[PDB]
Amino acid sequence: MNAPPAFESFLLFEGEKKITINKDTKVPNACLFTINKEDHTLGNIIKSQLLKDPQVLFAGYKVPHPLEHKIIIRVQTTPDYSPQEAFTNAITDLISELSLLEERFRVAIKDKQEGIE
Amino acid sequence: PSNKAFEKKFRFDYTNERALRRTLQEDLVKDVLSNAHIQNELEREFERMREDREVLRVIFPTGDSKVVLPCNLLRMIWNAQKIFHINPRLPSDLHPIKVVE
Amino acid sequence: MIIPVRCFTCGKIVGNKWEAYLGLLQAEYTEGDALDALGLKRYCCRRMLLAHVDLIEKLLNYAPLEK
Amino acid sequence: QSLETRAEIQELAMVPRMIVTPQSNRPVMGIVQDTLTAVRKFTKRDVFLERGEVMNLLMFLSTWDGKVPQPAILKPRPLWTGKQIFSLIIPGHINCIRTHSTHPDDEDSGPYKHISPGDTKVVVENGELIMGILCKKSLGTSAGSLVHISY
Amino acid sequence: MPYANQPTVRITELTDENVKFIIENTDLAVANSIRRVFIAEVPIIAIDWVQIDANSSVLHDEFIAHRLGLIPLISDDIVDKLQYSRDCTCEEFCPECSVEFTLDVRCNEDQTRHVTSRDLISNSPRVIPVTSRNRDNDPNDYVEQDDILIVKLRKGQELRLRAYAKKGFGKEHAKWNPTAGVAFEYDPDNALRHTVYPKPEEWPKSEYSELDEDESQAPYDPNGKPERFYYNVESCGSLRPETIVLSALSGLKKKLSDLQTQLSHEIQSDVLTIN
Amino acid sequence: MAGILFEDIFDVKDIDPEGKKFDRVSRLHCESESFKMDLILDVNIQIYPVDLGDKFRLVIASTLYEDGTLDDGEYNPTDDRPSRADQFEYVMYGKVYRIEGDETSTEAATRLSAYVSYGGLLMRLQGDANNLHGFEVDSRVYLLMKKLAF
Ligand SMILES: [Zn+2]
Ligand SMILES: [Zn+2]
Numbered sequence: 001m002n003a004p005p006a007f008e009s010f011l012l013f014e015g016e017k018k019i020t021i022n023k024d025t026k027v028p029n030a031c032l033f034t035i036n037k038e039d040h041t042l043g044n045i046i047k048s049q050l051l052k053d054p055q056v057l058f059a060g061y062k063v064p065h066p067l068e069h070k071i072i073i074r075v076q077t078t079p080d081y082s083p084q085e086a087f088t089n090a091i092t093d094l095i096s097e098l099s100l101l102e103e104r105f106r107v108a109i110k111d112k113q114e115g116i117e
Numbered sequence: 118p119s120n121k122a123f124e125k126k127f128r129f130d131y132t133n134e135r136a137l138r139r140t141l142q143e144d145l146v147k148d149v150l151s152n153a154h155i156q157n158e159l160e161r162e163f164e165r166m167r168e169d170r171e172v173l174r175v176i177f178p179t180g181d182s183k184v185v186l187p188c189n190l191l192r193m194i195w196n197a198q199k200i201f202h203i204n205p206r207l208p209s210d211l212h213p214i215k216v217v218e
Numbered sequence: 219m220i221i222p223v224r225c226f227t228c229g230k231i232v233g234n235k236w237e238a239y240l241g242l243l244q245a246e247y248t249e250g251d252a253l254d255a256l257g258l259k260r261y262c263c264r265r266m267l268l269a270h271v272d273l274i275e276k277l278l279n280y281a282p283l284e285k
Numbered sequence: 286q287s288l289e290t291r292a293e294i295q296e297l298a299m300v301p302r303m304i305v306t307p308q309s310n311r312p313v314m315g316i317v318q319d320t321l322t323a324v325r326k327f328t329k330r331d332v333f334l335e336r337g338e339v340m341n342l343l344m345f346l347s348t349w350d351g352k353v354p355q356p357a358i359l360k361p362r363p364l365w366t367g368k369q370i371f372s373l374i375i376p377g378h379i380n381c382i383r384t385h386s387t388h389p390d391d392e393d394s395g396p397y398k399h400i401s402p403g404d405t406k407v408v409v410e411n412g413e414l415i416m417g418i419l420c421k422k423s424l425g426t427s428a429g430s431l432v433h434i435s436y
Numbered sequence: 437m438p439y440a441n442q443p444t445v446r447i448t449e450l451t452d453e454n455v456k457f458i459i460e461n462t463d464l465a466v467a468n469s470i471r472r473v474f475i476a477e478v479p480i481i482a483i484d485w486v487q488i489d490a491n492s493s494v495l496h497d498e499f500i501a502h503r504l505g506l507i508p509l510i511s512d513d514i515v516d517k518l519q520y521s522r523d524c525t526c527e528e529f530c531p532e533c534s535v536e537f538t539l540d541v542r543c544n545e546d547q548t549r550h551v552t553s554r555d556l557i558s559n560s561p562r563v564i565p566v567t568s569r570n571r572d573n574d575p576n577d578y579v580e581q582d583d584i585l586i587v588k589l590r591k592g593q594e595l596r597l598r599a600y601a602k603k604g605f606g607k608e609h610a611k612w613n614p615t616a617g618v619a620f621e622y623d624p625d626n627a628l629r630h631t632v633y634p635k636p637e638e639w640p641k642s643e644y645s646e647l648d649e650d651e652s653q654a655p656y657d658p659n660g661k662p663e664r665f666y667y668n669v670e671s672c673g674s675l676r677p678e679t680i681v682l683s684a685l686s687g688l689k690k691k692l693s694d695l696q697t698q699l700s701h702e703i704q705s706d707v708l709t710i711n
Numbered sequence: 712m713a714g715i716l717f718e719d720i721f722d723v724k725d726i727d728p729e730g731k732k733f734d735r736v737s738r739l740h741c742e743s744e745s746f747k748m749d750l751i752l753d754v755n756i757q758i759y760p761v762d763l764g765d766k767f768r769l770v771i772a773s774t775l776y777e778d779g780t781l782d783d784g785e786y787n788p789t790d791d792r793p794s795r796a797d798q799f800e801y802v803m804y805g806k807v808y809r810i811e812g813d814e815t816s817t818e819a820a821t822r823l824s825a826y827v828s829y830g831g832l833l834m835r836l837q838g839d840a841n842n843l844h845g846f847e848v849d850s851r852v853y854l855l856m857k858k859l860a861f
Contacts, residue, residue, distance in 0.1 A: 006608050011522070018698035023711035026351035031711050035695075041472045042691065048465035051337055052439060057785065058353060060344035074344065078789055084708060091696050093437045095689060097466070100442045101459075102685040108445045109678055115450055116678065136817055185310070192434075195380050199411050202848050206814065219495070223506040223584050229672060230616040231508060233584040234568070241579060260617075274588055277494055278548060283593040284492070330831040331735045333755070355784040357830025359802035359853075361659075361758060363786065368831030401728070401751070402826075402833040408808075415808055415828050658758050 009069055012037055021084070030058070030076040031083040039063060043071040049090040055081050127166060129159055129213070143209045155214055162217055220274045227262035235267060304436050312432050315425040324371075328418045330404060332367035333358070339365050346373060368414045376435055378412035384429040386422050453616070455677035456668040464622065467665040471620050473684040476607040477691070478614045480675055481511040481518070481564065483537065484604070485529075489596035495587045500597070505611050507553060507584050508567045508674040509601060515675070515683075518603045534600045535560040539586075542594035549589045552582035556599075564601075567673050614675045619668035626654045628662060713772040713796055713853075716844040720744045720860060722766040736832065737761075751835040754856075759801050761859070768858045771844075772796060773851050782851040799857035805829030806850035812842075829854060 012018065016036055024030035035043065043061045050059035050073075058076035075083045109116055131150070133139055139147030149155055198205075221236045235256045242252040249268070258264045296302075306313040316324065326332075334342075339356075343349055354373065358364040389405035391398065396406065407417025409431070417423075423431055441461050449456040459467060486501045493500065514535075524533035536559040543549045553566040562570070568583035587595070606612045623630065624644035633639060636653045644666055648655070671677045702708055725740040732738070737756035742749060744766065754761065761767065775781060776794045796802070809826035813819045825845040827834040834854070838845075 007522075010607055019695070019702055021702060021708070021710055024351070030351075038695075041469050041476070042695065045465050045469040047341075048463050051340075052463070053437070054439065054788075057787075058340055058343075060340045062341075062344050083711075084703075088696070088699065089437060091692055091699070093440050095692055095696070097440050097442055097462075098685055098689055098692070101445070101462075102682065102689070104443065105445045105457075105681060105685070108447055111447065113447070113450055115452060136815070136819075192380065196378075199378070199380065204846070204848060206810070206847075219499075220503075220585060220587070223503055224613075224672075228617045229610070229613045230670075231583070231672065234582060236585065237580045237582070238578050274494070278588055278590045280494075283494055283543075283590050328831075329733070330753070331733045333735070352783075353785045355786045355804050357804055357832065358755065359786070359804060360797075360799070364755075366830035366832065402835070404831075404833065410808060414831070416831055416833060 010037060024074075027076065029079055029083065030074065033073040033075070033087065035071050035073065037069045038071060039069065040071075043073065045094065046073060046087075046090060049094050050075055050086065053086060053090065056086060123170065128163060131156055141208075143211070143213075146209070146211075146213065149212070149214075158217065159213065219277070220272065221267065221270050225263045225266045227266075228260070230258075230263045232258070232263060232266050236270075236272075239267060305433060311428050312426045312430060312436070315421075315427075315430060315432050317425075321421060321424060324419045324424060327367045328371055328414070330366060330368060330416075333364045334367070334370060336363055339370060342370055343373070348376070349373065368416070371419070372413040375409065375412045375414065375431070379431070379434045380410060381429060381431065381434055382406070382408055384423055384427065384431070385417060385420065387418065387420055389418075450677070453671045453673070453677070454668060455671075455681065456619075458664060458666050460664040462663075462665070464662045464665070467620070467622065470684065470688065471618055471667075473688050474615055474618050474669060474680060475613065477605055477687045478675070478680055478684050479515060479603050479605045479687070480612050480614050481509045481515055481535065481601045481603055482611045482674075483507070483509075483599045484521075484534075484602040485598075485600040487598040489598070491595055491597070492593045493587050493589055493595055494593065500587060500595070503584070503586055504597075504599065507556075507586075508672055510564055510567055511603075511675055512679050514564045515603060520604075521602050529600055531560075534602050535564055537599040537601060538597075539599070540596050541589070543589040543591050546591055550580070550582060551586040551589065551595060552580075553584050553586075554582065556586075614672060614680050616670040616672045618670070620665065621667075622662055622665045624666075627657050628660050629656065630662075712794060713774045713776075714778045715770060715772055716852075717771040717841055718769075719748065720766055720768045721750055723761070723763050726761065726763050741767075747839065748841075749837040751833075752854075753829075753832040753834065754801070755832075759856075766860045767856060768860055770796065770799070770855045770857070772853050772855065773849075775853065780851075796853070796855045799855040800859065801856035803829040803832065803854040805832075805834075805852055805854065807846050807848075807852055810845045810847050827852060827854075 018036060020034040020036075022032045022034070024032060040063065043063065047059055047061045050056050055078050056075065057078060058074070060075075061071055061073045063071045073087075075086060077083050077086055130138075133150070139150050197203075221233045223231060223233045225232050235258065238256055239252055242255060243249070246252065253264055253268065256267075258267060304312055304314060315321075336356075340353075343353065350373070354365065354369060356363040356365045357369050358366075383406060385405065385407045387405055390396070390403055395403065402416065404416055405418070407419065407423055408415045419431075421427070425432075427433070443462040443466075444460040446458045446460070447455070448458060483505045486504055488497050488500070491497050491500060495503075519533050521529075521533050524530065526533060529536075537556055538559055539551070539556050541549065541551050541555055554569050556566055558565055566583065568581060569577075589595070604612050606614065621642070621644060624642050625648050626633065633654070637651075641648075669677055669680060671680065675683075721741040721743050723739060724742050726737055728738060728740050735755060735757040736753055739750075739752045739754055739761070741752065750769075775796065776790075776792055805828050807825060807827045810824070811826070812823040813821045820842075822839040823837065823842050823845065825836045825838065825841070827836070
């Protein structure tokens with residue numbers, strides 16, 4: 001029985017960090033984030049929020065292998081703004097749009113629809 | 118093919134046709150046009166080429182030019198031209214005897 | 219061996235629509251209409267039921283459900 | 286089972302060294318199946334990429350320089366051609382004309398019909414793909430394929 | 437940030453099963469990621485442990501266990517207060533992390549008996565029953581309406597088992613899908629040329645493509661970007677459609693805010709000085 | 712403003728030669744208003760719908776910022792310097808790979824043909840007084856098309 005237990009696809013291991021940051025050795029103001037146990041769903045959206053920002057020079061992600069749950073996100077910013085703050089803003093802004101989307105959907109449901117419950 | 122065609126494409130002329138000879142393509146080589154020794158040594162070079170061409174015709178009677186050999190000299194010349202940024206319209210900077218020896 | 223709970227391709231539950239179907243065919247020779255009334259729109263859900271073979275019925279007939 | 290045989294394997298029989306076979310001095314292995322079809326389709330010069338997709342492809346590449354190339358079309362909006370992104374993939378600066386013999390054109394007399402570039406024939410220079418479309422004759426087990434020259 | 441648009445919603449249609457809506461002024465990556473949450477991330481309750489007391493039926497045990505896990509379960513009122521199994525302090529199971537089902541049937545009758553979803557009883561209060569036949573003044577009720585024929589039994593066969601349903605989400609197994617299906621569509625007239633039609637006359641027009649009632653077929657615009665995504669989420673029945681959407685967005689918010697806390701954890705623990 | 716290597720207004724003779732074509736690229740055949748030059752150029756017809764019968768203004772330069780090198784280019788959106796040939800409607804970046812002209816006899820060097828490659832999209836220009844600006848080395852050429860005149 002050489003198949004892995006299904007929970008392992010998403011459950012974090014006690015000996016691994018959720019996120020890791022490593023500096024690039026090539027070009028300045030680049031950064032490499034490793035996101036463990038998180039697939040395209042989180043990764044694809046964080047790539048897009050970074051592309052939405054006007055001060056990001058480069059943004060991308062790669063899930064190294066299907067069988068190994070892990071993605072990497074590389075980001076490069078202008079020589080003035082730090083890549084960590086851009087990442088912080090990218091989620092926080094994403095949190096803000098989704099909260100507003102949830103609010104607008106719920107109020108939209110609040111329309112005199114009679115099968116809400 | 119053609120002995121005349123071979124002679125034209127390979128022979129380094131000395132009579133210099135009025136085509137900026139010696140100062141076209143080559144640079145300071147216009148100064149070594151008066152050399153007797155350089156004329157005889159290249160004339161010796163061309164003499165080997167007619168003899169080689171004669172042996173090579175005996176080796177490959179069928180007339181195929183495709184042989185397996187190492188290096189691929191022509192691709193190397195291209196690697197050489199491309200990196201040093203050699204402009205083929207600009208004048209040369211090379212002495213012929215340096216090449217032969 | 220009895221129709222599966224939920225169609226393979228997507229998920230729409232489908233075992234519940236089997237007993238209903240044998241009744242409709244007995245009533246009408248309209249396989250098109252039968253599948254339609256049951257609500258099996260898209261054809262993945264439709265192949266499920268349309269292509270099933272209920273082997274269970276012959277299988278139950280052996281006297282020894284006792285071993 | 287020892288360092289001694291592991292050393293011997295790493296140096297003699299390791300795969301990357303097994304690329305060009307001494308049977309007929311050509312590549313034993315080249316780009317095959319879907320990727321080979323996908324390369325032809327990608328190199329056609331009607332293929333254009335917008336900033337978002339180029340960055341993702343740059344992202345999947347290993348030995349990428351780190352510098353992002355200037356798009357072959359600056360305005361109205363930045364676009365990189367397919368040849369342009371293929372050209373980051375070519376290592377160092379190898380060179381080869383031809384090595385296509387694709388169906389294309391008019392064998393024996395079309396290239397002499399003045400070279401209306403016709404785009405068919407593939408030309409690479411100083412490690413950058415200048416023109417043409419890549420196929421099995423460029424990329425395959427061919428005597429003069431890009432892969433043979435790279436080795 | 438100033439460049440966030442904050443989207444827009446419109447509900448076109450709502451039923452006991454479907455929910456059909458339009459999202460506008462947002463990004464595809466948002467639409468695609470949110471479509472993926474509707475499948476995988478929304479949690480629900482389904483049978484997860486089956487203990488077989490007696491099984492004389494003509495179906496083998498693991499087959500009974502399979503059919504039985506896959507049957508749908510209402511969860512709306514209770515899927516929230518329930519905690520995840522692994523997180524729960526208890527050894528094995530408890531009332532606080534799982535709900536118990538019991539099935540007992542025997543064919544004493546001469547006619548073949550069927551084993552159904554109603555015959556399955558919740559030892560837990562009837563807050564979380566099986567989907568079919570409860571407080572059902574339901575026009576969907578037809579003939580047997582057993583929801584699922586777990587098996588058939590001839591005179592003499594019997595079936596006794598226990599089951600423990602647990603909260604989990606679709607990424608882990610398909611029994612936890614909260615959807616019958618998820619339609620997703622954007623840019624119906626193919627303005628943006630994301631697909632390239634060979635002989636465009638050979639293709640039909642969807643119900644969203646009517647805007648070009650004409651047959652001119654696909655006017656081009658290169659200065660455009662993907663906008664106004666059309667959805668139709670359809671309920672498996674185990675969780676009502678709007679609750680699927682609201683729980684999806686919240687779960688996505690929970691997942692994102694958590695990643696922000698770990699990223700904060702990097703700046704607090706092992707001070708962010710590496711880069 | 713960038714130092715100008717070449718500048719002229721061209722008129723279009725044809726947009727589809729022989730007819731083999733593709734899609735989302737078109738091969739222009741053109742003729743210069745100075746009638747001493749000829750030109751062939753591939754263009755993205757999908758985003759810049761040109762038509763036969765109208766004279767288009769074209770310029771070529773090797774620089775953008777002031778009058779100096781910049782080919783290091785991570786094109787860099789952040790630059791705000793008005794040095795730019797930004798008022799032009801169509802811009803392409805590329806290198807010159809090949810040049811040709813009679814180069815054998817007396818004088819020779821009669822007129823001239825230049826071959827350029829913009830990322831796989833090809834160009835051919837014929838001339839004579841443009842010999843100072845043609846190469847078979849050196850990247851950094853920008854091809855600007857503008858105004859499409861009146
Ligand atoms: Zn289905
Ligand atoms: Zn517990």
